[PDB]
RNA sequence: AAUUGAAGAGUUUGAUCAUGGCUCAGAUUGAACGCUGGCGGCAGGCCUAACACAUGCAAGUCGAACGGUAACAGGAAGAAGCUUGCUUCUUUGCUGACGAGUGGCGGACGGGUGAGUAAUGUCUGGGAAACUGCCUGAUGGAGGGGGAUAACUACUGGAAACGGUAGCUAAUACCGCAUAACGUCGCAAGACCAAAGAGGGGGACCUUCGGGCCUCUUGCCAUCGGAUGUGCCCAGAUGGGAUUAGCUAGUAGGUGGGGUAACGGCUCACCUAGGCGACGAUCCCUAGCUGGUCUGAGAGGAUGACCAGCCACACUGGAACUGAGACACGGUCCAGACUCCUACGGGAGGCAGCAGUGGGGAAUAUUGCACAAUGGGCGCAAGCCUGAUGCAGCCAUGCCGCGUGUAUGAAGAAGGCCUUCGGGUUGUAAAGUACUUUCAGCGGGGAGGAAGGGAGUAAAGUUAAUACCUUUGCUCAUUGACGUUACCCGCAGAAGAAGCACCGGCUAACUCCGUGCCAGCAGCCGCGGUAAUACGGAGGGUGCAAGCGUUAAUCGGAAUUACUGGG
C-alpha cells in the first residue's frame, strides 16, 4: 500500500462452472438485472466482470465459462481474485469438468466457498454432492476442513440470501486492507477493438484511485489515459480498488490476463515498451528456432503431405489466444491444421490479403467484415465465415480436414480371364485371345497379367473385343480378345486379373 | 563537439604541434614527433593531391578546434565577402573568442582557453559570454571578469604568457586581465604556415 | 442544422412568402400592362402605365424588385407605349 | 557599398589514340529504415483512401428594437407564524436583470482540402457598358394613420423527433395615405417613389402628474460624392501527344422582342450563311497555377508542401430562396448512395474545423491550456463569444549552439597487438598528481510580452440647463494564458553525458588469424579454388559526430538533345 492510509477494499469474487448450473443465471439473480440467461450459445463463450448492486455492501463478480478451449482464460479469471466461489448442481454428483475447475482454484491458492445451486428441484440431493466431494481433496464441509457449503437455487431462481451473506462473511474474515489515496494498479480482464473509440480494454484496478490524467503501462501497451468508461455508469474519472473499468486510446491491443501499473512519465514508458518489443522479438526468435529442430523439416517429414490453413480474428484478445490453441489441438499427423495471422477485431484489407496470397479459410468469431475487406472479397471470394458458436467452428475445421484427406483404399477383383491362341495386330503389337473364367470384365479398370504368383505384365485394360467387335463389357464363359499398347509378350495359359478400385474417403476424428 | 582523445596523436598525424601542451617539454621528448602516427605509420611518407588538401584542412580545423560542418559555415561566409576569400577565412578562424583568449595567454592552451570561456569567466564590452564561437570585433575591449578573477587556473597561464609570441592584432594587458582588439589580423601575420591558396581550392574538388 | 440557425430558417421562409406575393402582384400587373400594349389601345395602355408607375417604384424602394431593374422597366414599357401614342 | 564566376575521375584493348555509353565523388529532402544517442535554441512535422467515423468542442450577439416573467437576485407593499422589530410567507416588473420568444445585424469572413480543372482557369498588361454591405464627407427631410401574428393562455396528437385546433398581445417587424428633386422615366409639361424611433438628464409651461415640452446623444430616410469590394471584356504568355486531321445548329453573324446590377446568343423569334483549322483546331492522356522554392557558373532544368496572392471544391447529383453579398465548409429543398436509432408506427447524419479513432501505407503528432496579448463577430460601452490567434505537449526530422573536462604526467606501467624476438606499437593515452565546474543535478532570486480598459476627479467644449454627456488632461484601484517564463545568484563534485561508417583501385586510411571459388563481399571495374591489404574475426588506421550510414527522390557533374554550347 503506497499511500499508507489503507482501508479494506470491497471484495473481488470469481465464479467458475459450466453447462447451465445456474451458471449464467446466478450472477443475473445477484445483480437482479433479468438477463435471464437469454444470450446466444446456451451459456456464454467468453469472460466478463461485473461490479454489483447489493446490500449491506458492494462486491465485484467475475465470470468465464470453464469449457475445454478456455484453459488459460479460466486460469486468468481464477488467479487475480480475492475469493473464488465454485458452483455445483444439486441434481446428482459432481462432474469431471467441475473437479478440473476445482484444480484451477487450488493451484492458484485462493480460499474457496461453495454452493449447492439447484436444491428446490424435486430430484435434487445436496447431501449426495456433500458426500461425493467428501471423496476428494476439495476441503469439503465438516467431514473435511470446511470450505462452507450453501444450499440455494439459481437454475430455478430462488434466493441466494445465505450465499450473499457467506461471500461477505469470508471477505470480512479475510484481511483486505488496501491503499485508497495513493497510486493505481491492476489487471486486464478482457480486451477488444472499437472502430470509433480505438483499441479498448476492461481493466480491474486492484490498487485504488486511477485518476483522469495518469500514465499507464500494461505489458507492451503504454499511454496516458484519455477517458474511462463503465457499464454500471458511463463516465468514470477516479476509480476504486476493486472495480472493472473500460480504458480507451492506446497504441495496440493490451494483453488480457496481466498487469497494468501507473508510471512516472510517458517518455520512459515508450522506452520500456520498446524494450518489451525487443522481448517480443526474443519470443519471436524463440518460436522461429523451435520449429526447425523439432523434426528436422521446415514442415512435414513424410511424402503423403496434407495441411489446412486458417486465418482467425476474434473480437476479444483473450479468446483469440485460447481458441486458436484448441484448433491446433484437434489435428492429426496426416492432415495438419495451422493458424496463419491471428487477428483481433474486425476483418480488414490486409487480413483478406493473407488468405488470398496463401490458401486458408478466413473466419472471425463475433467479428465481421468491413469495407476494405469487402473490396478484396468481391474481387476474390475466399472462404468467408463470420460465426455463431465455437463448437460448429471446431466441427467445420474438422470437416475441411476430412475433405482435404486422401480418399481411396480398396482393391477388389471384378474378373479373372485365361489366355489362349495369340494373334498379331498393328494396333497393339500382339492380341491375346482370352476366355473369361470367372467374374465380369469391363472396359477400363486396372489389370494384372500373372502366371503362378508373378506379374508377367502390367497395365490398364486397353481393348475389350468379343467375337469381332469391341464392346463395353464381357462376363465369364465368353470368348474375348485383348491387347495392350506395347504388349508382345503372350504366353498361353497366363491369367489376367481385372480388378475394381473403390474409394472410401477417410474422416478425421 | 570537442575532440576528447590523445592530443599527441593529432600532432604526429598533422606533422607539428598544435600547442596542446605547456612547452616545457614534449615537442621533442614525449611525443615521438612525426616519427610515426600509428602502428604501421613508420613506413609511409607518400601522399596524394586529395590527401595534401585534406591534411591542411585537418591541420587548420585541429588548430582552431572546429568541426567540418562549422568549418564549412566559415568557408561559405568567407565566400560572400568582398576581399580575399582565403584571407577572410583565416580572419574568421582567428576571430574566435577562445582564440583571442589563447592570444592573450589567459588560457595556456586553446582547450584551457575554451574551458575559461565556457565557465562564465570572460566579459566582452561588459557583457558576459559563455559561447565559444563568439567573434571579437574592432574596438572590443575583452577581459576576465572581476568576480573570481585570477584564480590558480589563470595564474599558472600568466607565466608562459610573459614570453612567447605576443603580436599586435590585439592590445594585451594581462595585469588586470584584459585586452583590446583594435586592428584586424592581416595576411603577413599568419600566412605560409598554412597552404591557404590550396585550402581555398579544395571544396571545388 | 445543429446550431441555433433554426431561427434563420424560419426567417427566410416568411419573408419569401411575403416577397413572392408582392412579386406576384407586380408581375400580374405588368402583364396586364403588356396586354394593352399587345392590344394596341394607346389610351388603355397609358392608363395601365399610369397604374404601374407608383407600384413599380414602390417595390423598388422596398428593394425586392430592385432599383435599376425597376428603372429599366419604366424605360422599356415607355418605349412601346409612346410609339403607340 | 549592390556581378569573385564554371575542375574531374574510373571503366571497352596485348598495348594506343578516338568515338561512345555506363558508373562515382557534389549539393538537396515535409523522408524512411538501420545502429547508436546528453542538454539547449529556432524552424518544420499524413505527399497514401475527396475512405468512413464514436464522444466532446469550433458564432453568435443586442432588454439602449419589443411583448414578457420562464429565470433568480434584491426591494417594497401586504398577508401572517413572531424573533415582537423584524424575521417569515403569498402578491407586485417596483428594481439589477434575463430563458424561451419576437424583431435587427452577424451566419457569404477567417479555417480546411487539391478531387474535378490545360484555360471558361491562372499570370502580366490594357479596357468599358457596371454594380458595390458596413464605413465617411456634403445637402435636406424625419408628417399623419391602420391592420395582423408568433410567443403567451385554454383544449389536443405524439415512443421520440416533432406538432395540431381557437382566441388574446407589442415592435426600429408588416401595410396604406400625406409629404418629394438636384432622382428615376420623359422632348418638355408632368407623373411617382421615404420616415423609426430609441436613450440620458433638466429650469420654465403645466400634465388623463404616465409625463407634455426643452435640450444633448444616437439611430431611421432620400440624393450627389469618396475610398473599398466585386462582376464584366479584350490582348499576349501560361502541360504532353499527329500511331488525335478535320472541327462547329445557337454553331457564326444581323435585326427585333425578352432577360441581367450591367456589356453580351445572355435567351427567344425571325433573317443571312458563315465560323474555326498546320501560328496545331478537335479529341485523348495528364495537371491546381503564379509571386517563389530547390538545383545550376550562367544560360537552363526540376519543383509549387512551407509562406502569401488567386482560383476551385465542401457525403454523390441538381435547383432555387433569403440577403448588400452565396447558387451558401458546421443554411434550406429535393433526388441519390450509405449509416444509425426506435416503443417498429415513424424519426435522425455528413470531422477535406480542432482534437481523436478505425482503415490505408515505409511513414508524419496531444480526445492539452487561455481569451492574458494580437485580429475578428455583435454591442454605445461594460460585456460576451473567438479550436482564428497566442501558447504548451509529442518526434535527433532539418538547421544551428554547446557539453560529454582542463593542465601536468615515462617507469614511455601492465595488458592487448605485432615482433627478423633486437624490439616496436597501442600510448601522455591510461594510472598517478595538480586544477576548473559550463551545461545538467539541487536550493534561492526575477525582466518583458501591459499598451489599455474600468472607477474616481478636474479642465475645456457643449446646452435654456452650475445641467448632463462626450472629448482632453490628472489621480487611484487594477488587468499575465504561457508560468516551476526568458534571465540572474548560491552550493557540492570529474562527478551525469560518444557513437557510427570505411580502409584493392576509385578514395583519405594495413597487418595478422580463420574460412578455402565454400561461406560471402559488390555503387563501379571486381575480390575468394590455404600465405585473401577486397570474405569472417581481431589488432591498427582514417573520416565524421549526437548523430552516423544505407535506401528512395531531384537537379548536378552531362557541351550525354549541344540557345549560350554538338555531330
CSV table of N, CA, C and O (backbone and C1' of nucleotides) in Angstrom, one decimal, chain D residues 254-300:
chain,number,residue,atom,x,y,z
D,254,G,P,-23.5,40.6,-84.9
D,254,G,O5',-24.7,41.0,-85.8
D,254,G,C5',-24.5,42.0,-86.9
D,254,G,C4',-25.8,42.0,-87.8
D,254,G,C3',-27.0,42.5,-87.1
D,254,G,O3',-27.0,43.9,-87.1
D,254,G,C1',-27.5,40.5,-88.3
D,255,U,P,-27.5,44.7,-85.8
D,255,U,O5',-29.1,44.6,-85.9
D,255,U,C5',-29.8,45.2,-86.9
D,255,U,C4',-31.2,44.7,-87.1
D,255,U,C3',-32.1,44.7,-85.9
D,255,U,O3',-32.7,46.1,-85.7
D,255,U,C1',-32.3,42.6,-86.9
D,256,G,P,-32.7,46.7,-84.3
D,256,G,O5',-33.9,45.9,-83.6
D,256,G,C5',-35.2,46.3,-84.0
D,256,G,C4',-36.2,45.2,-83.6
D,256,G,C3',-36.4,44.8,-82.1
D,256,G,O3',-37.3,45.8,-81.5
D,256,G,C1',-36.2,42.9,-83.4
D,257,G,P,-37.0,46.2,-80.0
D,257,G,O5',-37.6,44.9,-79.3
D,257,G,C5',-39.0,44.8,-79.1
D,257,G,C4',-39.5,43.4,-78.8
D,257,G,C3',-39.1,43.0,-77.3
D,257,G,O3',-40.1,43.6,-76.4
D,257,G,C1',-38.6,41.2,-78.8
D,258,G,P,-39.5,44.2,-75.1
D,258,G,O5',-39.0,42.9,-74.3
D,258,G,C5',-39.9,42.1,-73.6
D,258,G,C4',-39.3,40.7,-73.3
D,258,G,C3',-38.3,40.6,-72.1
D,258,G,O3',-39.0,40.6,-70.9
D,258,G,C1',-37.4,39.4,-74.0
D,259,G,P,-38.4,41.3,-69.6
D,259,G,O5',-37.0,40.6,-69.3
D,259,G,C5',-37.0,39.3,-68.7
D,259,G,C4',-35.6,38.6,-68.6
D,259,G,C3',-34.6,39.4,-67.7
D,259,G,O3',-34.7,39.0,-66.3
D,259,G,C1',-33.6,38.9,-69.8
D,260,U,P,-34.5,40.0,-65.1
D,260,U,O5',-32.9,40.2,-65.0
D,260,U,C5',-32.1,39.2,-64.4
D,260,U,C4',-30.6,39.4,-64.5
D,260,U,C3',-30.1,40.7,-63.8
D,260,U,O3',-29.7,40.4,-62.4
D,260,U,C1',-29.3,40.6,-66.1
D,261,A,P,-30.3,41.3,-61.3
D,261,A,O5',-30.0,42.7,-61.8
D,261,A,C5',-30.3,43.9,-61.1
D,261,A,C4',-29.2,45.0,-61.3
D,261,A,C3',-28.7,45.2,-62.8
D,261,A,O3',-29.6,46.0,-63.6
D,261,A,C1',-26.9,45.0,-61.3
D,262,A,P,-29.9,45.4,-65.0
D,262,A,O5',-28.5,45.6,-65.8
D,262,A,C5',-28.1,46.9,-66.0
D,262,A,C4',-26.7,47.0,-66.7
D,262,A,C3',-26.5,46.1,-67.8
D,262,A,O3',-27.0,46.7,-69.0
D,262,A,C1',-24.7,45.8,-66.3
D,263,C,P,-27.1,45.9,-70.4
D,263,C,O5',-25.5,45.7,-70.8
D,263,C,C5',-24.9,46.8,-71.5
D,263,C,C4',-23.6,46.3,-72.2
D,263,C,C3',-23.8,45.3,-73.3
D,263,C,O3',-24.3,45.9,-74.5
D,263,C,C1',-22.0,44.7,-72.0
D,264,G,P,-25.6,45.2,-75.2
D,264,G,O5',-25.3,43.6,-75.3
D,264,G,C5',-24.3,43.2,-76.4
D,264,G,C4',-23.7,41.8,-76.1
D,264,G,C3',-24.6,40.6,-76.3
D,264,G,O3',-24.7,40.3,-77.7
D,264,G,C1',-23.4,40.4,-74.3
D,265,G,P,-26.0,40.0,-78.5
D,265,G,O5',-26.2,38.4,-78.2
D,265,G,C5',-25.2,37.5,-78.4
D,265,G,C4',-25.4,36.2,-77.6
D,265,G,C3',-24.4,35.1,-77.9
D,265,G,O3',-24.1,34.2,-76.8
D,265,G,C1',-26.5,34.3,-78.5
D,266,C,P,-23.3,34.8,-75.5
D,266,C,O5',-24.5,34.9,-74.4
D,266,C,C5',-24.3,34.5,-73.1
D,266,C,C4',-25.6,34.5,-72.3
D,266,C,C3',-26.8,33.9,-73.0
D,266,C,O3',-26.8,32.5,-72.8
D,266,C,C1',-27.4,36.0,-72.3
D,267,U,P,-27.0,31.6,-74.1
D,267,U,O5',-28.6,31.7,-74.3
D,267,U,C5',-29.5,31.2,-73.3
D,267,U,C4',-30.9,31.7,-73.5
D,267,U,C3',-31.6,31.5,-74.9
D,267,U,O3',-32.1,30.2,-75.0
D,267,U,C1',-32.0,33.7,-74.0
D,268,C,P,-32.5,29.6,-76.4
D,268,C,O5',-33.9,30.3,-76.5
D,268,C,C5',-34.7,30.3,-77.7
D,268,C,C4',-35.9,31.2,-77.6
D,268,C,C3',-36.4,31.6,-79.0
D,268,C,O3',-37.3,30.5,-79.5
D,268,C,C1',-36.1,33.5,-77.8
D,269,A,P,-37.1,29.9,-80.9
D,269,A,O5',-37.8,31.0,-81.8
D,269,A,C5',-39.2,31.1,-81.8
D,269,A,C4',-39.6,32.5,-82.4
D,269,A,C3',-39.0,32.7,-83.8
D,269,A,O3',-39.9,32.0,-84.8
D,269,A,C1',-38.4,34.5,-82.5
D,270,C,P,-39.3,31.2,-86.0
D,270,C,O5',-38.7,32.3,-86.9
D,270,C,C5',-39.6,33.2,-87.7
D,270,C,C4',-38.9,34.5,-88.1
D,270,C,C3',-37.7,34.3,-89.0
D,270,C,O3',-38.2,34.1,-90.4
D,270,C,C1',-37.1,35.7,-87.3
D,271,C,P,-37.4,33.1,-91.4
D,271,C,O5',-36.1,34.0,-91.7
D,271,C,C5',-36.3,35.2,-92.5
D,271,C,C4',-35.1,36.1,-92.6
D,271,C,C3',-33.8,35.4,-93.2
D,271,C,O3',-33.9,35.4,-94.6
D,271,C,C1',-33.3,36.6,-91.2
D,272,U,P,-33.2,34.2,-95.4
D,272,U,O5',-31.7,34.5,-95.2
D,272,U,C5',-31.1,35.6,-95.9
D,272,U,C4',-29.6,35.9,-95.4
D,272,U,C3',-28.7,34.6,-95.6
D,272,U,O3',-28.3,34.5,-97.0
D,272,U,C1',-28.4,35.6,-93.5
D,273,A,P,-28.0,33.1,-97.5
D,273,A,O5',-26.7,32.7,-96.7
D,273,A,C5',-25.4,33.3,-97.1
D,273,A,C4',-24.3,32.9,-96.1
D,273,A,C3',-23.8,31.5,-96.4
D,273,A,O3',-22.4,31.4,-96.2
D,273,A,C1',-24.6,31.6,-94.2
D,274,G,P,-21.3,31.8,-97.2
D,274,G,O5',-20.3,32.6,-96.3
D,274,G,C5',-19.6,32.1,-95.2
D,274,G,C4',-19.9,32.8,-93.9
D,274,G,C3',-18.9,32.4,-92.8
D,274,G,O3',-17.8,33.4,-92.9
D,274,G,C1',-21.0,31.7,-92.1
D,275,G,P,-16.3,32.9,-92.7
D,275,G,O5',-16.3,32.4,-91.2
D,275,G,C5',-16.5,33.3,-90.1
D,275,G,C4',-16.5,32.6,-88.7
D,275,G,C3',-15.3,31.8,-88.4
D,275,G,O3',-14.3,32.7,-87.8
D,275,G,C1',-17.1,30.5,-88.1
D,276,C,P,-12.8,32.6,-88.3
D,276,C,O5',-12.2,31.3,-87.6
D,276,C,C5',-12.2,31.2,-86.2
D,276,C,C4',-12.0,29.8,-85.7
D,276,C,C3',-10.7,29.1,-86.4
D,276,C,O3',-9.5,29.4,-85.6
D,276,C,C1',-12.6,27.7,-86.5
D,277,G,P,-8.2,29.8,-86.4
D,277,G,O5',-7.9,28.4,-87.1
D,277,G,C5',-7.4,27.3,-86.2
D,277,G,C4',-7.2,26.0,-87.0
D,277,G,C3',-6.3,26.2,-88.3
D,277,G,O3',-4.9,26.3,-87.9
D,277,G,C1',-8.2,24.7,-88.7
D,278,A,P,-4.0,27.1,-88.9
D,278,A,O5',-2.6,26.4,-88.9
D,278,A,C5',-2.0,26.0,-87.6
D,278,A,C4',-0.8,25.0,-87.8
D,278,A,C3',0.1,25.4,-89.0
D,278,A,O3',1.5,25.2,-88.7
D,278,A,C1',-0.9,23.4,-89.5
D,279,C,P,2.4,26.4,-88.3
D,279,C,O5',1.7,27.1,-87.1
D,279,C,C5',2.3,27.1,-85.8
D,279,C,C4',1.7,28.2,-84.8
D,279,C,C3',0.2,28.1,-84.8
D,279,C,O3',-0.3,28.3,-83.4
D,279,C,C1',1.0,30.2,-85.6
D,280,G,P,-0.5,27.0,-82.5
D,280,G,O5',-1.2,25.9,-83.4
D,280,G,C5',-2.6,25.8,-83.5
D,280,G,C4',-3.2,24.4,-83.6
D,280,G,C3',-2.9,23.6,-82.3
D,280,G,O3',-4.1,22.8,-82.0
D,280,G,C1',-1.9,22.5,-84.2
D,281,A,P,-4.8,23.1,-80.6
D,281,A,O5',-6.3,23.2,-81.3
D,281,A,C5',-6.9,24.5,-81.5
D,281,A,C4',-8.0,24.5,-82.5
D,281,A,C3',-9.1,23.6,-82.2
D,281,A,O3',-10.1,24.1,-81.4
D,281,A,C1',-8.4,23.2,-84.4
D,282,U,P,-10.3,23.6,-79.9
D,282,U,O5',-10.9,22.1,-80.1
D,282,U,C5',-12.2,21.9,-80.6
D,282,U,C4',-12.3,20.5,-81.3
D,282,U,C3',-12.1,19.4,-80.3
D,282,U,O3',-13.3,19.1,-79.6
D,282,U,C1',-10.9,19.0,-82.3
D,283,C,P,-13.2,18.8,-78.1
D,283,C,O5',-12.5,17.4,-78.1
D,283,C,C5',-13.2,16.2,-78.6
D,283,C,C4',-12.3,15.0,-78.8
D,283,C,C3',-11.6,14.5,-77.6
D,283,C,O3',-12.4,13.6,-76.8
D,283,C,C1',-10.1,14.7,-79.4
D,284,C,P,-12.3,13.6,-75.2
D,284,C,O5',-11.0,12.9,-75.0
D,284,C,C5',-10.8,11.4,-75.2
D,284,C,C4',-9.4,11.0,-75.3
D,284,C,C3',-8.5,11.1,-74.0
D,284,C,O3',-8.8,10.0,-73.1
D,284,C,C1',-7.3,11.9,-75.8
D,285,C,P,-8.9,10.2,-71.5
D,285,C,O5',-7.4,10.3,-71.2
D,285,C,C5',-6.5,9.1,-71.2
D,285,C,C4',-5.1,9.5,-71.3
D,285,C,C3',-4.6,10.2,-70.0
D,285,C,O3',-4.4,9.3,-68.9
D,285,C,C1',-3.8,11.3,-71.9
D,286,U,P,-4.9,9.7,-67.5
D,286,U,O5',-3.9,10.8,-67.1
D,286,U,C5',-2.5,10.7,-66.8
D,286,U,C4',-1.7,12.0,-66.8
D,286,U,C3',-2.2,13.0,-65.7
D,286,U,O3',-1.6,12.7,-64.4
D,286,U,C1',-2.0,14.1,-67.8
D,287,A,P,-2.4,13.2,-63.1
D,287,A,O5',-2.2,14.8,-63.2
D,287,A,C5',-1.0,15.4,-62.8
D,287,A,C4',-1.0,16.9,-62.8
D,287,A,C3',-2.1,17.5,-61.9
D,287,A,O3',-1.8,17.5,-60.5
D,287,A,C1',-2.1,18.6,-64.0
D,288,G,P,-2.9,17.6,-59.4
D,288,G,O5',-3.5,19.0,-59.6
D,288,G,C5',-2.8,20.2,-59.1
D,288,G,C4',-3.2,21.4,-59.9
D,288,G,C3',-2.2,22.6,-59.9
D,288,G,O3',-1.2,22.4,-60.9
D,288,G,C1',-4.4,23.4,-59.4
D,289,C,P,0.3,22.8,-60.6
D,289,C,O5',0.3,24.4,-60.8
D,289,C,C5',0.2,24.8,-62.1
D,289,C,C4',-0.2,26.3,-62.3
D,289,C,C3',0.9,27.3,-61.8
D,289,C,O3',2.0,27.4,-62.7
D,289,C,C1',-1.2,28.0,-61.1
D,290,U,P,3.5,27.6,-62.1
D,290,U,O5',3.3,29.1,-61.6
D,290,U,C5',3.4,30.2,-62.6
D,290,U,C4',3.0,31.6,-62.0
D,290,U,C3',4.0,32.1,-61.0
D,290,U,O3',5.1,32.7,-61.7
D,290,U,C1',1.8,32.3,-60.1
D,291,G,P,6.5,32.9,-60.9
D,291,G,O5',6.2,34.0,-59.9
D,291,G,C5',6.2,35.4,-60.1
D,291,G,C4',5.9,36.2,-58.8
D,291,G,C3',7.1,36.0,-57.7
D,291,G,O3',8.2,36.9,-57.9
D,291,G,C1',5.0,35.6,-56.7
D,292,G,P,9.6,36.4,-57.6
D,292,G,O5',9.5,35.8,-56.2
D,292,G,C5',10.4,34.7,-55.8
D,292,G,C4',9.7,33.7,-54.9
D,292,G,C3',10.6,32.5,-54.5
D,292,G,O3',11.4,32.8,-53.4
D,292,G,C1',8.6,31.7,-55.4
D,293,U,P,12.9,32.4,-53.3
D,293,U,O5',12.9,30.8,-53.0
D,293,U,C5',12.3,30.3,-51.8
D,293,U,C4',12.0,28.8,-52.0
D,293,U,C3',13.2,27.9,-52.3
D,293,U,O3',14.0,27.6,-51.1
D,293,U,C1',11.5,27.3,-53.7
D,294,C,P,15.6,27.8,-51.2
D,294,C,O5',16.0,26.6,-52.1
D,294,C,C5',15.8,25.2,-51.6
D,294,C,C4',16.0,24.2,-52.7
D,294,C,C3',17.3,24.3,-53.6
D,294,C,O3',18.5,23.8,-52.9
D,294,C,C1',15.5,23.9,-55.0
D,295,U,P,19.8,24.6,-53.2
D,295,U,O5',20.4,23.9,-54.5
D,295,U,C5',20.5,22.5,-54.6
D,295,U,C4',20.5,22.1,-56.1
D,295,U,C3',21.5,22.8,-57.0
D,295,U,O3',22.8,22.2,-56.9
D,295,U,C1',19.4,23.0,-58.0
D,296,G,P,24.1,23.1,-56.9
D,296,G,O5',24.1,23.7,-58.3
D,296,G,C5',24.3,22.8,-59.5
D,296,G,C4',24.1,23.6,-60.8
D,296,G,C3',24.9,24.9,-60.9
D,296,G,O3',26.3,24.5,-61.2
D,296,G,C1',22.7,25.3,-61.6
D,297,A,P,27.4,25.4,-60.4
D,297,A,O5',27.0,26.9,-61.0
D,297,A,C5',27.5,28.0,-60.2
D,297,A,C4',28.0,29.2,-61.0
D,297,A,C3',27.0,29.8,-62.0
D,297,A,O3',26.2,30.8,-61.2
D,297,A,C1',29.0,29.4,-63.2
D,298,G,P,24.6,30.6,-61.2
D,298,G,O5',24.2,31.2,-62.6
D,298,G,C5',24.4,32.6,-62.9
D,298,G,C4',24.7,32.9,-64.4
D,298,G,C3',23.5,32.5,-65.2
D,298,G,O3',22.6,33.6,-65.3
D,298,G,C1',25.4,31.5,-66.1
D,299,A,P,21.0,33.2,-65.3
D,299,A,O5',21.0,32.5,-66.7
D,299,A,C5',20.9,33.2,-68.0
D,299,A,C4',21.1,32.2,-69.2
D,299,A,C3',20.0,31.2,-69.4
D,299,A,O3',18.8,31.9,-70.0
D,299,A,C1',22.0,30.2,-69.6
D,300,G,P,17.5,31.2,-69.7
D,300,G,O5',17.7,29.7,-70.3
D,300,G,C5',16.9,28.6,-69.7
D,300,G,C4',17.6,27.3,-69.8
D,300,G,C3',16.8,26.2,-69.0
D,300,G,O3',15.8,25.6,-69.9
D,300,G,C1',19.0,26.2,-68.2
